[PDB]
Structures are given as C-alpha cells and as structure tokens.
PDB file of all heavy atoms in Angstrom:
ATOM      1  N   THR D   1       4.065   2.545  11.449  1.00 52.26           N
ATOM      2  CA  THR D   1       4.401   3.792  12.078  1.00 52.26           C
ATOM      3  C   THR D   1       5.545   4.481  11.274  1.00 52.26           C
ATOM      4  O   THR D   1       6.634   3.889  11.156  1.00 52.26           O
ATOM      5  CB  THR D   1       4.807   3.622  13.517  1.00 52.26           C
ATOM      6  OG1 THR D   1       3.946   2.603  14.157  1.00 52.26           O
ATOM      7  CG2 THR D   1       4.739   4.972  14.290  1.00 52.26           C
ATOM      8  N   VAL D   2       5.258   5.606  10.687  1.00 51.92           N
ATOM      9  CA  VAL D   2       6.251   6.285   9.834  1.00 51.92           C
ATOM     10  C   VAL D   2       6.437   7.694  10.473  1.00 51.92           C
ATOM     11  O   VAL D   2       5.742   8.206  11.242  1.00 51.92           O
ATOM     12  CB  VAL D   2       5.694   6.406   8.379  1.00 51.92           C
ATOM     13  CG1 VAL D   2       5.125   5.051   7.928  1.00 51.92           C
ATOM     14  CG2 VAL D   2       4.585   7.455   8.255  1.00 51.92           C
ATOM     15  N   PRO D   3       7.643   8.390   9.983  1.00 50.24           N
ATOM     16  CA  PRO D   3       7.832   9.732  10.432  1.00 50.24           C
ATOM     17  C   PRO D   3       6.816  10.637   9.912  1.00 50.24           C
ATOM     18  O   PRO D   3       6.251  10.456   8.806  1.00 50.24           O
ATOM     19  CB  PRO D   3       9.296  10.043   9.885  1.00 50.24           C
ATOM     20  CG  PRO D   3       9.836   8.740   9.648  1.00 50.24           C
ATOM     21  CD  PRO D   3       8.737   7.835   9.307  1.00 50.24           C
ATOM     22  N   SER D   4       6.538  11.758  10.653  1.00 49.42           N
ATOM     23  CA  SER D   4       5.493  12.671  10.229  1.00 49.42           C
ATOM     24  C   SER D   4       6.018  13.729   9.164  1.00 49.42           C
ATOM     25  O   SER D   4       5.306  14.087   8.337  1.00 49.42           O
ATOM     26  CB  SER D   4       4.943  13.361  11.459  1.00 49.42           C
ATOM     27  OG  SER D   4       5.973  13.882  12.240  1.00 49.42           O
ATOM     28  N   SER D   5       7.259  14.058   9.311  1.00 49.24           N
ATOM     29  CA  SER D   5       7.811  15.112   8.430  1.00 49.24           C
ATOM     30  C   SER D   5       7.934  14.617   7.032  1.00 49.24           C
ATOM     31  O   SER D   5       7.967  15.426   6.080  1.00 49.24           O
ATOM     32  CB  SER D   5       9.213  15.586   8.983  1.00 49.24           C
ATOM     33  OG  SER D   5      10.067  14.545   9.106  1.00 49.24           O
ATOM     34  N   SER D   6       8.084  13.339   6.803  1.00 47.87           N
ATOM     35  CA  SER D   6       8.223  12.705   5.515  1.00 47.87           C
ATOM     36  C   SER D   6       6.853  12.405   4.930  1.00 47.87           C
ATOM     37  O   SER D   6       6.846  11.712   3.866  1.00 47.87           O
ATOM     38  CB  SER D   6       9.149  11.577   5.574  1.00 47.87           C
ATOM     39  OG  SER D   6       8.593  10.526   6.395  1.00 47.87           O
ATOM     40  N   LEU D   7       5.746  12.819   5.486  1.00 45.71           N
ATOM     41  CA  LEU D   7       4.499  12.421   4.997  1.00 45.71           C
ATOM     42  C   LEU D   7       4.138  13.206   3.658  1.00 45.71           C
ATOM     43  O   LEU D   7       3.197  12.799   2.968  1.00 45.71           O
ATOM     44  CB  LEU D   7       3.316  12.664   6.009  1.00 45.71           C
ATOM     45  CG  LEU D   7       3.286  11.650   7.119  1.00 45.71           C
ATOM     46  CD1 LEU D   7       2.247  12.075   8.154  1.00 45.71           C
ATOM     47  CD2 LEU D   7       2.883  10.313   6.562  1.00 45.71           C
ATOM     48  N   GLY D   8       4.776  14.345   3.455  1.00 50.32           N
ATOM     49  CA  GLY D   8       4.520  15.086   2.253  1.00 50.32           C
ATOM     50  C   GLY D   8       5.382  14.668   1.101  1.00 50.32           C
ATOM     51  O   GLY D   8       5.097  14.990  -0.046  1.00 50.32           O
ATOM     52  N   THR D   9       6.496  13.996   1.258  1.00 48.36           N
ATOM     53  CA  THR D   9       7.411  13.554   0.235  1.00 48.36           C
ATOM     54  C   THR D   9       7.362  12.112  -0.052  1.00 48.36           C
ATOM     55  O   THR D   9       7.540  11.739  -1.185  1.00 48.36           O
ATOM     56  CB  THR D   9       8.787  13.961   0.566  1.00 48.36           C
ATOM     57  OG1 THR D   9       9.326  13.145   1.574  1.00 48.36           O
ATOM     58  CG2 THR D   9       8.913  15.469   0.989  1.00 48.36           C
ATOM     59  N   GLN D  10       7.084  11.297   0.911  1.00 47.14           N
ATOM     60  CA  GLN D  10       7.115   9.818   0.753  1.00 47.14           C
ATOM     61  C   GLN D  10       5.695   9.354   0.266  1.00 47.14           C
ATOM     62  O   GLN D  10       4.703   9.958   0.491  1.00 47.14           O
ATOM     63  CB  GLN D  10       7.556   9.119   2.037  1.00 47.14           C
ATOM     64  CG  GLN D  10       8.913   9.513   2.542  1.00 47.14           C
ATOM     65  CD  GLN D  10      10.008   9.019   1.658  1.00 47.14           C
ATOM     66  OE1 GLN D  10       9.721   8.138   0.860  1.00 47.14           O
ATOM     67  NE2 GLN D  10      11.203   9.614   1.768  1.00 47.14           N
ATOM     68  N   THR D  11       5.737   8.204  -0.413  1.00 47.75           N
ATOM     69  CA  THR D  11       4.494   7.570  -0.856  1.00 47.75           C
ATOM     70  C   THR D  11       4.374   6.217  -0.149  1.00 47.75           C
ATOM     71  O   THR D  11       5.342   5.437  -0.190  1.00 47.75           O
ATOM     72  CB  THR D  11       4.516   7.390  -2.349  1.00 47.75           C
ATOM     73  OG1 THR D  11       5.792   7.049  -2.848  1.00 47.75           O
ATOM     74  CG2 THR D  11       4.142   8.749  -3.041  1.00 47.75           C
ATOM     75  N   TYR D  12       3.245   5.883   0.358  1.00 45.60           N
ATOM     76  CA  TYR D  12       2.929   4.703   1.130  1.00 45.60           C
ATOM     77  C   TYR D  12       1.722   3.887   0.350  1.00 45.60           C
ATOM     78  O   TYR D  12       0.605   4.301   0.551  1.00 45.60           O
ATOM     79  CB  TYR D  12       2.621   4.912   2.516  1.00 45.60           C
ATOM     80  CG  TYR D  12       3.823   5.478   3.297  1.00 45.60           C
ATOM     81  CD1 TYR D  12       3.828   6.839   3.636  1.00 45.60           C
ATOM     82  CD2 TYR D  12       4.801   4.611   3.750  1.00 45.60           C
ATOM     83  CE1 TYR D  12       4.970   7.405   4.365  1.00 45.60           C
ATOM     84  CE2 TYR D  12       5.876   5.094   4.483  1.00 45.60           C
ATOM     85  CZ  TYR D  12       5.963   6.362   4.760  1.00 45.60           C
ATOM     86  OH  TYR D  12       7.001   6.938   5.508  1.00 45.60           O
ATOM     87  N   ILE D  13       2.196   2.958  -0.383  1.00 42.14           N
ATOM     88  CA  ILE D  13       1.204   2.068  -1.149  1.00 42.14           C
ATOM     89  C   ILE D  13       1.249   0.652  -0.469  1.00 42.14           C
ATOM     90  O   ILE D  13       2.348  -0.020  -0.514  1.00 42.14           O
ATOM     91  CB  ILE D  13       1.488   1.995  -2.667  1.00 42.14           C
ATOM     92  CG1 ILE D  13       1.089   3.330  -3.261  1.00 42.14           C
ATOM     93  CG2 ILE D  13       0.748   0.846  -3.228  1.00 42.14           C
ATOM     94  CD1 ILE D  13       1.314   3.306  -4.787  1.00 42.14           C
ATOM     95  N   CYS D  14       0.124   0.184   0.078  1.00 44.01           N
ATOM     96  CA  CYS D  14      -0.057  -1.101   0.592  1.00 44.01           C
ATOM     97  C   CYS D  14      -0.325  -2.113  -0.575  1.00 44.01           C
ATOM     98  O   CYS D  14      -1.292  -1.869  -1.320  1.00 44.01           O
ATOM     99  CB  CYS D  14      -1.069  -1.259   1.688  1.00 44.01           C
ATOM    100  SG  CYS D  14      -2.672  -0.799   1.083  1.00 44.01           S
ATOM    101  N   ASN D  15       0.391  -3.219  -0.655  1.00 46.53           N
ATOM    102  CA  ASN D  15       0.245  -4.240  -1.750  1.00 46.53           C
ATOM    103  C   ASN D  15      -0.494  -5.420  -1.144  1.00 46.53           C
ATOM    104  O   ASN D  15       0.110  -6.341  -0.519  1.00 46.53           O
ATOM    105  CB  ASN D  15       1.476  -4.602  -2.249  1.00 46.53           C
ATOM    106  CG  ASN D  15       2.047  -3.521  -3.212  1.00 46.53           C
ATOM    107  OD1 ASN D  15       2.977  -2.761  -2.785  1.00 46.53           O
ATOM    108  ND2 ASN D  15       1.604  -3.428  -4.474  1.00 46.53           N
ATOM    109  N   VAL D  16      -1.852  -5.441  -1.166  1.00 43.53           N
ATOM    110  CA  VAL D  16      -2.585  -6.532  -0.643  1.00 43.53           C
ATOM    111  C   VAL D  16      -2.714  -7.626  -1.681  1.00 43.53           C
ATOM    112  O   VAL D  16      -3.061  -7.273  -2.908  1.00 43.53           O
ATOM    113  CB  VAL D  16      -3.990  -6.072  -0.241  1.00 43.53           C
ATOM    114  CG1 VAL D  16      -4.840  -7.190   0.300  1.00 43.53           C
ATOM    115  CG2 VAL D  16      -3.800  -4.973   0.864  1.00 43.53           C
ATOM    116  N   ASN D  17      -2.546  -8.891  -1.389  1.00 47.46           N
ATOM    117  CA  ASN D  17      -2.598 -10.025  -2.328  1.00 47.46           C
ATOM    118  C   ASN D  17      -3.383 -11.157  -1.725  1.00 47.46           C
ATOM    119  O   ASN D  17      -3.046 -11.692  -0.680  1.00 47.46           O
ATOM    120  CB  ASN D  17      -1.192 -10.387  -2.601  1.00 47.46           C
ATOM    121  CG  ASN D  17      -0.980 -11.058  -4.001  1.00 47.46           C
ATOM    122  OD1 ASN D  17      -1.305 -12.215  -4.165  1.00 47.46           O
ATOM    123  ND2 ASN D  17      -0.503 -10.319  -4.976  1.00 47.46           N
ATOM    124  N   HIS D  18      -4.471 -11.476  -2.510  1.00 47.23           N
ATOM    125  CA  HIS D  18      -5.255 -12.538  -1.976  1.00 47.23           C
ATOM    126  C   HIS D  18      -5.309 -13.574  -3.100  1.00 47.23           C
ATOM    127  O   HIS D  18      -6.161 -13.529  -4.023  1.00 47.23           O
ATOM    128  CB  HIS D  18      -6.771 -12.124  -1.663  1.00 47.23           C
ATOM    129  CG  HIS D  18      -7.539 -13.219  -1.058  1.00 47.23           C
ATOM    130  ND1 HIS D  18      -8.546 -13.897  -1.664  1.00 47.23           N
ATOM    131  CD2 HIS D  18      -7.535 -13.673   0.346  1.00 47.23           C
ATOM    132  CE1 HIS D  18      -9.097 -14.768  -0.866  1.00 47.23           C
ATOM    133  NE2 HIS D  18      -8.543 -14.704   0.386  1.00 47.23           N
ATOM    134  N   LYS D  19      -4.390 -14.518  -3.132  1.00 45.82           N
ATOM    135  CA  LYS D  19      -4.277 -15.541  -4.185  1.00 45.82           C
ATOM    136  C   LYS D  19      -5.423 -16.484  -4.344  1.00 45.82           C
ATOM    137  O   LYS D  19      -5.858 -16.815  -5.409  1.00 45.82           O
ATOM    138  CB  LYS D  19      -2.939 -16.372  -3.967  1.00 45.82           C
ATOM    139  CG  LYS D  19      -1.739 -15.359  -3.781  1.00 45.82           C
ATOM    140  CD  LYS D  19      -0.482 -16.328  -3.708  1.00 45.82           C
ATOM    141  CE  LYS D  19       0.795 -15.460  -3.355  1.00 45.82           C
ATOM    142  NZ  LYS D  19       0.923 -14.249  -4.332  1.00 45.82           N
ATOM    143  N   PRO D  20      -6.043 -16.932  -3.208  1.00 47.52           N
ATOM    144  CA  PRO D  20      -7.284 -17.824  -3.397  1.00 47.52           C
ATOM    145  C   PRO D  20      -8.376 -17.280  -4.167  1.00 47.52           C
ATOM    146  O   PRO D  20      -9.052 -17.995  -4.908  1.00 47.52           O
ATOM    147  CB  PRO D  20      -7.729 -18.007  -1.865  1.00 47.52           C
ATOM    148  CG  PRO D  20      -6.523 -17.901  -1.110  1.00 47.52           C
ATOM    149  CD  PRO D  20      -5.645 -16.849  -1.800  1.00 47.52           C
ATOM    150  N   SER D  21      -8.507 -15.971  -4.124  1.00 45.66           N
ATOM    151  CA  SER D  21      -9.540 -15.292  -5.067  1.00 45.66           C
ATOM    152  C   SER D  21      -8.889 -14.671  -6.395  1.00 45.66           C
ATOM    153  O   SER D  21      -9.649 -14.205  -7.206  1.00 45.66           O
ATOM    154  CB  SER D  21     -10.244 -14.116  -4.290  1.00 45.66           C
ATOM    155  OG  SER D  21     -11.212 -13.545  -5.138  1.00 45.66           O
ATOM    156  N   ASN D  22      -7.587 -14.735  -6.399  1.00 43.99           N
ATOM    157  CA  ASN D  22      -6.817 -14.277  -7.617  1.00 43.99           C
ATOM    158  C   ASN D  22      -7.145 -12.836  -7.881  1.00 43.99           C
ATOM    159  O   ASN D  22      -7.340 -12.411  -8.988  1.00 43.99           O
ATOM    160  CB  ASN D  22      -7.143 -15.127  -8.826  1.00 43.99           C
ATOM    161  CG  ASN D  22      -6.004 -15.135  -9.862  1.00 43.99           C
ATOM    162  OD1 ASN D  22      -5.323 -14.158  -9.996  1.00 43.99           O
ATOM    163  ND2 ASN D  22      -5.773 -16.205 -10.578  1.00 43.99           N
ATOM    164  N   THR D  23      -7.170 -11.992  -6.795  1.00 44.35           N
ATOM    165  CA  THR D  23      -7.384 -10.583  -6.966  1.00 44.35           C
ATOM    166  C   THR D  23      -6.341  -9.918  -6.088  1.00 44.35           C
ATOM    167  O   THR D  23      -6.136 -10.249  -4.861  1.00 44.35           O
ATOM    168  CB  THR D  23      -8.789 -10.111  -6.462  1.00 44.35           C
ATOM    169  OG1 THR D  23      -8.775  -8.706  -6.293  1.00 44.35           O
ATOM    170  CG2 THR D  23      -9.224 -10.832  -5.113  1.00 44.35           C
ATOM    171  N   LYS D  24      -5.548  -8.951  -6.682  1.00 46.04           N
ATOM    172  CA  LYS D  24      -4.465  -8.259  -5.990  1.00 46.04           C
ATOM    173  C   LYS D  24      -4.710  -6.756  -6.046  1.00 46.04           C
ATOM    174  O   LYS D  24      -4.726  -6.204  -7.194  1.00 46.04           O
ATOM    175  CB  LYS D  24      -3.118  -8.606  -6.719  1.00 46.04           C
ATOM    176  CG  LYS D  24      -3.140  -9.869  -7.588  1.00 46.04           C
ATOM    177  CD  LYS D  24      -3.164 -11.142  -6.724  1.00 46.04           C
ATOM    178  CE  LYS D  24      -3.170 -12.316  -7.605  1.00 46.04           C
ATOM    179  NZ  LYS D  24      -2.895 -13.590  -6.899  1.00 46.04           N
ATOM    180  N   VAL D  25      -4.960  -6.155  -4.945  1.00 45.91           N
ATOM    181  CA  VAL D  25      -5.324  -4.722  -4.788  1.00 45.91           C
ATOM    182  C   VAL D  25      -4.063  -4.053  -4.203  1.00 45.91           C
ATOM    183  O   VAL D  25      -3.581  -4.422  -3.220  1.00 45.91           O
ATOM    184  CB  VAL D  25      -6.587  -4.546  -3.933  1.00 45.91           C
ATOM    185  CG1 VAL D  25      -7.013  -3.092  -4.021  1.00 45.91           C
ATOM    186  CG2 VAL D  25      -7.656  -5.492  -4.327  1.00 45.91           C
ATOM    187  N   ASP D  26      -3.771  -2.876  -4.890  1.00 44.63           N
ATOM    188  CA  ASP D  26      -2.691  -1.958  -4.409  1.00 44.63           C
ATOM    189  C   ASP D  26      -3.276  -0.683  -4.129  1.00 44.63           C
ATOM    190  O   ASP D  26      -3.443   0.127  -5.136  1.00 44.63           O
ATOM    191  CB  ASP D  26      -1.537  -1.942  -5.348  1.00 44.63           C
ATOM    192  CG  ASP D  26      -1.988  -1.938  -6.758  1.00 44.63           C
ATOM    193  OD1 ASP D  26      -3.031  -2.406  -7.167  1.00 44.63           O
ATOM    194  OD2 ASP D  26      -1.256  -1.380  -7.654  1.00 44.63           O
ATOM    195  N   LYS D  27      -3.621  -0.322  -2.905  1.00 45.80           N
ATOM    196  CA  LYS D  27      -4.350   0.894  -2.572  1.00 45.80           C
ATOM    197  C   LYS D  27      -3.315   1.924  -2.022  1.00 45.80           C
ATOM    198  O   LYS D  27      -2.619   1.625  -0.966  1.00 45.80           O
ATOM    199  CB  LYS D  27      -5.490   0.644  -1.649  1.00 45.80           C
ATOM    200  CG  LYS D  27      -6.371   1.903  -1.432  1.00 45.80           C
ATOM    201  CD  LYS D  27      -6.920   2.266  -2.690  1.00 45.80           C
ATOM    202  CE  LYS D  27      -7.583   3.654  -2.554  1.00 45.80           C
ATOM    203  NZ  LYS D  27      -6.530   4.774  -2.218  1.00 45.80           N
ATOM    204  N   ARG D  28      -3.339   3.073  -2.566  1.00 47.46           N
ATOM    205  CA  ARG D  28      -2.426   4.221  -2.001  1.00 47.46           C
ATOM    206  C   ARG D  28      -3.185   4.938  -0.927  1.00 47.46           C
ATOM    207  O   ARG D  28      -4.352   5.327  -1.001  1.00 47.46           O
ATOM    208  CB  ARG D  28      -2.047   5.074  -3.190  1.00 47.46           C
ATOM    209  CG  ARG D  28      -1.577   6.527  -2.695  1.00 47.46           C
ATOM    210  CD  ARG D  28      -1.441   7.420  -3.852  1.00 47.46           C
ATOM    211  NE  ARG D  28      -2.584   7.332  -4.759  1.00 47.46           N
ATOM    212  CZ  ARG D  28      -2.687   8.119  -5.806  1.00 47.46           C
ATOM    213  NH1 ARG D  28      -1.867   9.136  -6.134  1.00 47.46           N
ATOM    214  NH2 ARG D  28      -3.791   7.939  -6.646  1.00 47.46           N
ATOM    215  N   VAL D  29      -2.501   5.063   0.167  1.00 48.32           N
ATOM    216  CA  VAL D  29      -3.135   5.770   1.346  1.00 48.32           C
ATOM    217  C   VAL D  29      -2.304   7.052   1.607  1.00 48.32           C
ATOM    218  O   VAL D  29      -1.167   7.090   1.600  1.00 48.32           O
ATOM    219  CB  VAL D  29      -3.102   4.837   2.625  1.00 48.32           C
ATOM    220  CG1 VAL D  29      -1.680   4.365   2.840  1.00 48.32           C
ATOM    221  CG2 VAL D  29      -3.560   5.649   3.835  1.00 48.32           C
TER     222      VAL D  29
END
C-alpha cells in the first residue's frame, strides 16, 4: 500500500528471487 500522489514520481520494482530454479526476475509495475 503506497501513497497515490507519489505514483507519478516514485518507481516500484518488485525483486522476485527463486534460488531453487536459479532465476531472478525483477518486474517493474
């Protein structure tokens, strides 16, 4: 849950890390 007014200036990138498969996905939303 993030502030709405800062949705135009801030960047939210989720860093998903699955070591058992050795694949690390960083998807920007």
Side-chain angles (χ1 to χ4, degrees):
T1 321
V2 312
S4 49
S5 57
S6 63
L7 284 175
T9 73
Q10 301 290 340
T11 44
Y12 292 102
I13 286 184
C14 61
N15 289 97
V16 180
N17 206 280
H18 191 258
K19 311 184 186 305
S21 178
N22 207 327
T23 166
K24 342 285 182 169
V25 192
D26 43 328
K27 190 59 195 62
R28 159 190 44 175
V29 53

